[PDB]
Amino acid sequence: MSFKFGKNSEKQLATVKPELQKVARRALELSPYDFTIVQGIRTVAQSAQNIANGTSFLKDPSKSKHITGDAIDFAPYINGKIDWNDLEAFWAVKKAFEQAGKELGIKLRFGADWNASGDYHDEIKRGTYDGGHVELV
Ligand SMILES: [Ca+2]
Numbered sequence: 470m471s472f473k474f475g476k477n478s479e480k481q482l483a484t485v486k487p488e489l490q491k492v493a494r495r496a497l498e499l500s501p502y503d504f505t506i507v508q509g510i511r512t513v514a515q516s517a518q519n520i521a522n523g524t525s526f527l528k529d530p531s532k533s534k535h536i537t538g539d540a541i542d543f544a545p546y547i548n549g550k551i552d553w554n555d556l557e558a559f560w561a562v563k564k565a566f567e568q569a570g571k572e573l574g575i576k577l578r579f580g581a582d583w584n585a586s587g588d589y590h591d592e593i594k595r596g597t598y599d600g601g602h603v604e605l606v
């Protein structure tokens with residue numbers, strides 16, 4: 470008796486090899502509100518074609534770029550459709566992720582609060598939540 474992400478949306482988080490796939494899916498299993506992933510991490514199929522030379526521009530960076538395999542941009546979905554009006558609805562969906570890592574035992578962090586994101590009250594008007602970017606520990 471739980472929601473689920475679309476075929477194109479689920480494939481985004483389902484393409485991740487990290488534990489993120491857990492907090493992502495498990496979220497809907499431990500979250501009051503509904504939500505779906507839109508942006509997903511890339512793979513060699515994207516990095517290789519991009520450069521194609523052993524990427525000699527890096528040595529051991531962080532998970533900043535989605536090419537690292539850790540990162541997902543979701544959005545607050547309501548009534549089976551994206552919702553940018555229900556502000557509070559985003560609150561319950563925010564902890565939805567950090568709430569999963571608790572039972573999973575893993576740690577993860579996402580960006581979508583004035584704390585650093587700069588804002589999370591009117592940013593939704595952008596149509597992309599100007600955030601909702603999570604990342605596994
Ligand atoms: Ca933030």
Ligand SMILES: [Zn+2]
Binds near residue numbers: 508541542602
């Ligand atoms: Zn992003």
